[PDB]
Design an enzyme around this catalytic site. Sequence first.
Site, PDB file in Angstrom:
ATOM      1  N   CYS A 216       0.811  -1.218   0.000  1.00 49.04           N
ATOM      2  CA  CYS A 216       0.000   0.000   0.000  1.00 49.04           C
ATOM      3  C   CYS A 216       0.859   1.290   0.000  1.00 49.04           C
ATOM      4  CB  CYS A 216      -0.949  -0.114   1.203  1.00 49.04           C
ATOM      5  SG  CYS A 216      -1.614   1.421   1.903  1.00 49.04           S
TER       6      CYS A 216
ATOM      7  N   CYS B 146       0.314   3.800   2.750  1.00 48.41           N
ATOM      8  CA  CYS B 146       0.829   3.229   3.982  1.00 48.41           C
ATOM      9  C   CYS B 146       2.329   3.516   4.122  1.00 48.41           C
ATOM     10  CB  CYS B 146       0.612   1.731   3.988  1.00 48.41           C
ATOM     11  SG  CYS B 146      -1.134   1.223   3.871  1.00 48.41           S
TER      12      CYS B 146
END
Lengths: 105, 105, 105, 105
Positions: free
Chosen positions: B29, B32
């Site tokens: 991600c 992230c």
Amino acid sequence: ATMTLTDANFQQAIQGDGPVLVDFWAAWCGPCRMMAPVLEEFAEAHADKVTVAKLNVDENPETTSQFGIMSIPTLILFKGGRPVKQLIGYQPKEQLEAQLADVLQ
Amino acid sequence: ATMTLTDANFQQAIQGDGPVLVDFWAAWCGPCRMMAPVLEEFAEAHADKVTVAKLNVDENPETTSQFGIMSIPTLILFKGGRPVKQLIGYQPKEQLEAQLADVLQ
Amino acid sequence: ATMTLTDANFQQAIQGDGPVLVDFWAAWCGPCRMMAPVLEEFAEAHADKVTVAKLNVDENPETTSQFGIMSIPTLILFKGGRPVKQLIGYQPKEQLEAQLADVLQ
Amino acid sequence: ATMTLTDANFQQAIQGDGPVLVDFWAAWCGPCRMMAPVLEEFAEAHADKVTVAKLNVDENPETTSQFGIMSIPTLILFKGGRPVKQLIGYQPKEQLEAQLADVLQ
């Protein structure tokens, strides 16, 4: 049901010989559970127009990160070994078939 | 320092007294990866107000599914062993701080 | 009695003094299905003090985003057209009663 | 040449009085950063025929959703305010030239 893709077999498993619809999914993903039977049925119904491939992002971060995936599930159609179409992953059979009309013809 | 949690120890780890901010993330991600250093800095600045914990969804589907997580990253604040606030996971430190103004006061 | 709201009618439904408890759910979410019967009974029992609405997140992405719903089930109580309380996770009858004692006046 | 587009000016710029090549990117996206130098060079030898613009997906959710961008990098060529070609993934110079040529005269 048709193929399981991994970071290891991706490059080869998605080359030339036919359109491949890749489903980027996760074990924790709720909509992916609703989509599972829809894709199974889709694969069966158009097994000669396209190949459905499953890529579990939980275990395959390179491919997932490589394509800049932002939401799960995500669908990407590959033709000639290249990504040619991207679609949100939650798609009823009607909408899914409508958007992929070209390859199914 | 952040606290790493798993499906196996999640329950005991969030049992109240002393707020816990749980980051549901994944290595593939992008947002992230942007937030990793942000949350570590945040943890270092507010360690006696809140504990920042990380739950890797690639490896912990049980907890992720239990909270009906839909997109990552997702932040959930726990108090009293109960989830009391849910926040968009990708946010600048200054916005996160405004959002958690109460627990930081 | 758990009327259903959508992205097309949500805004004016809540743009009112009328206390409205909104249940953010999806068919794939187990705890969400666990709370449907509880809420139905709750709506029936406190119809004079609160109106219970259901908002399916898969079908209504606009409302889901606007209210930063990242975890389902989530209940948001609206009063005066603004969210005043959020409840995250499955809430049994006793908890709902206790948590919403306010609107229950 | 690398005009910056936002949710506020996008539709307007896309009705651009000439073709516009929009680069969907994010700061966490490696292949996107790799593409940045390539696009500038393309914008150069074709500045009389096309304008290259950038849209950061993290900062512009509406445009991102409007165009169903699920993977980045993605380029969308607009001709007359309508999308006419979409390229997914890294495009080396030779590929950009060949794919966009029919818009290069």
